[PDB]
């Protein structure tokens, strides 16, 4: 049953077991049916918490590598950290490949609404961005361009099909502005995108209902927080 797999994903989220939450939601997304707003959000939460733990682990092991890579040890010990980091990077890769495979084969082709189209292309940009984080050389550029075009596609649909105050559109602008700053190293693009999205939303904020207001203003503060910190780093 579909509503059973969705319910199990809820329990898995409460129990904070996100590997099972993914399995449940992946099964739902693997069906031809278009996901509801709740199932859409559950699927995203599932994969973000799964990819989040590995990313967090990766940064730590990378820091340990970099720290011990200065005089603290040599070769074989550093070798252990690198092989352990690579194991995580392999784990990160298959998680990204998994959701992207679901996105390309299932979600994106089956999306009727422009709201879900922006959402799915945003995710596509996100996990290609995660790939570009630990990647190096030519395989990093591939993930960078894949993330860029996925973000661009979502942006063209969001601008046309969605109001500036829409959570998915604001969230897309948040993540894409991050992509510009963190990955492509383009502070001008990043600041312009985050500020523009923030400004377009401000005007219509008073036209939003309560639940829409909370969702929108949450991301808008994140947009402001990024603009704040980016300003500090440039100084």
């Amino acid at each position: 049953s579909r509503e059973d797999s969705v319910y199990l994903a809820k329990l898995a989220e409460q129990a904070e077991r996100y590997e099972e939450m993914v399995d449940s939601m992946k099964a739902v997304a693997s069906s031809g049916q278009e996901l509801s707003v709740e199932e859409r959000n559950l699927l995203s939460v599932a994969y973000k918490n799964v990819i989040g733990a590995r990313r967090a682990s990766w940064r730590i092991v990378s820091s340990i590598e970099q720290k011990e890579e200065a005089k603290d040890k040599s070769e074989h010990q550093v070798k252990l950290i690198r092989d352990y980091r690579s194991k995580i990077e392999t784990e990160l890769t298959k998680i990204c490949d998994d959701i992207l495979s679901v996105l390309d084969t299932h979600l994106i082709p089956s999306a009727t609404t422009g709201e879900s189209k922006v959402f799915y292309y945003k995710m596509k940009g996100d996990y290609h961005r995660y790939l570009a984080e630990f990647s190096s050389g030519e395989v990093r550029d591939k993930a960078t361009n894949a993330s860029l075009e996925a973000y661009k596609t979502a942006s063209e649909i969001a601008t046309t099909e969605l109001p500036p105050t829409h959570p998915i559109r604001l969230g897309l602008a948040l993540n894409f502005s991050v992509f510009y700053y963190e990955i492509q190293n383009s502070p001008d693009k990043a600041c312009h995108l985050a500020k523009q999205a923030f400004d377009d939303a401000i005007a219509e904020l008073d036209t939003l209902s309560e639940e829409s207001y909370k969702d929108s203003t949450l991301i808008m503060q994140l947009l402001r927080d990024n603009l704040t910190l980016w300003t500090s780093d440039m100084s």
């Binding site: 973000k48 897309l172 948040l174 993540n175 700053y181 994140l222 927080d225 990024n226 910190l229 980016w230």
Partner: peptide, 6 residues
């Protein structure tokens, strides 16, 4: 830097 926490 913070991304969308959905």
């Amino acid at each position: 830097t913070a991304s969308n926490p959905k």
